Amino acid sequence: HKTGYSLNSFYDQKEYMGRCVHYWKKLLPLLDLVKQKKSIPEPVDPLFKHFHNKDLEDEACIAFATLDLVTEDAIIAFESVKNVVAYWNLALIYQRKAEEIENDCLPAEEQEEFQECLLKCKGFLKMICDEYSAY
Amino acid sequence: LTWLGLQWHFLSTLPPLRKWLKQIFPRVPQETSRLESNIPESICLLDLEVFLLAVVQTSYLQLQDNNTTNRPRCLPLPICKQLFTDRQRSWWDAVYSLITKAKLRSVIQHDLTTLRAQEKHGLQPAVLVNWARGLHKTGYSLNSFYDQKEYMGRCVHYWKKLLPLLDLVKQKKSIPEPVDPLFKHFHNKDIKVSEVKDLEDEACIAFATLDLVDGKTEDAIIAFESVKNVVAYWNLALIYQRKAEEIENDCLPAEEQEEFQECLLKCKGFLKMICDEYSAY
Amino acid sequence: NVEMAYARQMYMYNEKVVSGHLQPSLVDLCTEAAERLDDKNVSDLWVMVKQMTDVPLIPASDTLKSRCSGQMQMAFVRQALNYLEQSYKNYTLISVGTYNLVRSFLNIRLVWALIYYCMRCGDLMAAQQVVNRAQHQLGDFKNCFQEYIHNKDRRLSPTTENKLRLHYRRAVRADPYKRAVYCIIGRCDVSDNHSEVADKTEDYLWLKLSQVCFEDEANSSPQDRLTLPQFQKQLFEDYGESHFAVNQQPYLYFQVLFLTAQFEAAIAFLFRLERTRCHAVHVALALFELKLLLKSTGQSAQLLSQEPGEPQGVRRLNFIRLLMLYTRKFEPTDPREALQYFYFLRNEKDNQGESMFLRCVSELVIESREFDMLLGKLEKDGSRKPGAIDKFTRDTKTIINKVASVAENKGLFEEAAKLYDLAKNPDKVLELTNKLLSPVVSQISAPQSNRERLKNMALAIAERYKSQGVEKSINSTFYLLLDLITFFDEYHAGHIDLSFDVIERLKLVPLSQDSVEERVAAFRNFSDEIRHNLSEILLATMNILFTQYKRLKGSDSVLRSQARALITFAGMIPYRMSGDTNARLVQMEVLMN
């Protein structure tokens, strides 16, 4: 997804989001198995069976919001996920609409960027760029 | 509404359907999520404007047919009689009831299945051809790309749906229809042998233009370098200018020669162009 | 039997749906067959189905979300509580008019009694009558009831409901009808079941529904509020079925779940009920045709599978596996019923991208083997007397073509060939015929070695195509197979003369030293199946020349010339054949030398 949203091409974002959602979807029902239970009984190494390191909905709705974005329903769908990318999308829609027009939409930017600051204190480079410039 | 549309038709100028329908239908969004679900409660304004388009065309055709061959051609509201059909009024009744609202979905379900050209319908190619051209004009009208794109969506949908049915003119009926489903006629709606390829080149136009209104300048040109008309060359020429605004030199004689193609096609005065070449060239 | 009543129902519904006439009523048709068929379980259960599901629809492209939008709960409670009141009063008429039945019923068990009777008979009118009757000492209950009857969903004012809560907490906490009314109306004593008047399970649940507060009033106190997740969760998990008496639950717990909107749950339980297999199938199919069933992705997965990320508890059941198992019941006699069941499949998405009904048709009907009633008969004339497949669709050609594709994948040679031929598939028919005839050509055709039947069938398809005007390459290839077969029959009978005549007639092998070049220049123009027969043909022809030379010796220059021509052909041929055959040909040349 990162290398995909790097580019401009719609016909590249397409396949990149497709494979990203596919891998998250494949992992997803396996992500349910983690309750003191056996992950995959693999005595052999399939190609990569590693210990003490290893042990799609959110990016899907992010994808649908940026889909309709690529400006009211944009914010509508942007206010459904709540990660750093959601808060950032809402922050920059706020700045875009309220550079030099109205005040109370600036505290919106403020409080949301402070959710993002509490997120960046939490070790989140989950934004495409580091927040050391955003906050 | 239908009398006004008929008059604008006689005056050879398409209606401002979007304004009137925005005024009547207040809250309906402009598009649909999926074009496969027979969803009566996912109405778009554009489905309704498509109904209105073919309703105007059919009503005008029927009044033309009704032994008018009478200087007032539209016969103002009080003097004339019903111009649309009774079942179109039924669609109007039930859809308006649901929009400006125990609910039976017979009329609306049957009629959405017809309109969206999903699994089973009855209406014949000239219908979707005129629909597609009307929505081509309505999409080319706005400067807003955000609406242009979904309007190209409508054009492209009707077109790709007309493709596989229209190839059925090989000494064969389109569809045996005892009942007039939504717009069923003859000696107008039957599409002859020659204009199929014409519609196909127009469909190549519409598809490449869609992907131009979607950011893929690569296969946009890949597709636009296929048909042998004026539209392809004008598209490519604007594309060369735009993409090589201040990039390279060698790709400018290319636009030069393609505009010379367009000049050889203007020498015969081809008015198929939207804006006159005496301005662009 | 009752399966057959439901069957005739299904056949009529499917014929109407196909012919495109006005919508047939699955729900009323089931209830009506139940009206006729003296199964009180059928009558009551189907009337309950229609009378709880007869609410306003809302497709809105959202199945579970439309079924879970609070107004869905409001309409559910409306139909359910009204039907319950009506059935209670229709039993009351036995203790018996309305108020007379209610009083004689208070005595059948043995002003609040009359107002409670109006509540349990569904009459806000009689409630207000007894209200204005006893408004002397009760005061503001009349006004709160009037506001309840002025708000159509019986939704009280928030200040009024707080007043009712504090009022039942103050006084009615120690008249049971007054306590029940004040609590259910003011959303009070939500924890209390008020067991003083609560003697029925469904009535208790409807009282809890009257206690249910559906809105996000952040100023609604913590415990006196009922949310749908809490109520349905305690009802399904915590209440359990072994408490709800699974014995009478064949009419009762399924009913409680279907009236509290545990749709796939009721369907699962009544599917586990033996005598309710076809019933559960019919109810679930009605709902899913209404698009009401929230379905599950994986088919192999358990009858109820819960997706990851789905609202906690919303049950997604495999309609695929359900109806497939339900059709595996009567698949052995009523494949017509298999088709009438498949009628729901032709619109969905099979994971590869195939039609579900078409996949089921191919697999099931091919396994069922009744072709003439299944897809049609290529009659004595060769027209396709169409099967029930053209009785549901009009694309029997694509049906037989998908039959040919799935049958190719399923290794059925004669069957795939029959299906493709019915679809009029020339290349596929001829190619399968060539693959089959490559092994059955030379094999010693004993009495019924499948050899004579293969010859008759190949020649029959050949006469059909040739007589009707059906390419030339494959056609002449078949002619070559027939010629080689007849010549092999003569060689196996010992007819050396006719064998030589036929070998000269087919003009494939070098009969003269200068003809090796021409036959080798032609050999590259043959089909590979001919390169498969050339080896045996050459062995047989060399042996024939040797036998003719033996006759001429025991009774030869032309025979030796033919042996040398055969040597030249077999040596310069681009087919690297078994060296043993060349060795035996050289041995024959030597014994001729």
From Swiss-Prot, chain C:
Q: How does it sit in the membrane?
A: Peripheral membrane protein
What keywords tag this UniProt record? Membrane, mRNA transport, Nuclear pore complex, Nucleus, Protein transport, Translocation, Transport
Is-annotated flag, keyword Translocase?
A: no
**What highest taxon heads this organism's lineage?**
Eukaryota
Q: Is Protein transport found in the keyword set?
A: yes
A single Gene Ontology CC annotation of this entry is: nuclear pore
Q: What is an example of a GO molecular function annotated in this UniProt entry?
A: structural constituent of nuclear pore
- Which compartments is it annotated to reside in? Nucleus membrane; Nucleus, Nuclear pore complex
Q: Name one GO biological process term.
A: nuclear pore complex assembly
What is stated as this protein's family in its record?
Answer: Belongs to the nucleoporin interacting component (NIC) family.
Task: Sum up the protein's function in the record's words.
Answer: Plays a role in the nuclear pore complex (NPC) assembly and/or maintenance.
The protein depicted here goes by the name Nuclear pore complex protein Nup93
- Which species? Xenopus laevis (African clawed frog)
Portion of the full-length sequence here: 180 to 820 of 820
